[PDB]
Amino acid sequence: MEKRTPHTRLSQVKKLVNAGQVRTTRSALLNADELGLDFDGMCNVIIGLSESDFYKSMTTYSDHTIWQDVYRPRLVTGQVYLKITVIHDVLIVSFKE
Amino acid sequence: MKCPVCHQGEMVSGIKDIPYTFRGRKTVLKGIHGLYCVHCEESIMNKEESDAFMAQVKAFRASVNAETVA
Ligand SMILES: [Zn+2]
């Protein structure tokens, strides 16, 4: 239920974000706020990602067809775990629970 | 799509009143638009929705931070 390669190529992630094709969970939004990041802030973090920030891709028993790519960028604000899923050309961003 | 947190509930477009607590005070954030999990309380929001939510959150925190404690 885990892979060492990302499900979505990072170039495609950034293309979606750069096209505004991005949504976030409510918990991630409040979490990002604690770190001084608004919605646009989260987008800037995503566009600052490198392949080296990639941690793992994971699926679940409940939703075995959907993969979440986990990244752990180091920001001035600290190290953050982001989880990204691409659903019908929209990037969905959450934070590790 | 299925919820990104519980992985079960289908997400459905809608409006909810969302309780919010801050520094021993509370409010209900009215008419929050988003995609709501039918199984847990998570939701997904785009930029416009996110910004409007956080503006109400931030308005309430501004109110609480200025409030007298007797
Ligand atoms: Zn859910």
Numbering used by the authors:
A (entry chain B): 1 to 97
B (entry chain A): 1 to 70
Authors' own words:
Our biochemical and structural analysis of the E. coli MqsA antitoxin and the MqsR:MqsA-N complex provide a detailed 3-dimensional structural view of the free antitoxin and the TA complex. These structures combined with our biochemical data unequivocally demonstrate that MqsR, a protein previously shown to be critical for biofilm formation and the most highly upregulated gene in persister cells in E. coli, and MqsA form a novel bacterial TA system.
Moreover, following co-expression, the MqsR:MqsA-N complex is readily purified and forms a heterodimer (one copy of MqsR and one copy of MqsA-N), as determined using size exclusion chromatography, and confirmed using dynamic light scattering. The structure of MqsR reveals that it is a member of the RelE/YoeB family of bacterial RNase toxins. MqsA recognition of MqsR occurs at two distinct interfaces. The primary interface is centered on MqsA β-strand 3 (Ser43-Met45), which interacts with MqsR β-strand 2 (Val22-Thr25) to form a single continuous β-sheet (β1R-β3R-β4R-β5R-β6R-β2R-β3A-β2A-β1A) throughout the complex. The only exception is Gln68, which is part of the secondary interface. This suggests neutralization is achieved either through cellular localization (i.e., towards DNA via MqsA-C) or through steric occlusion by blocking the interaction of MqsR with other biomolecules, such as the ribosome.
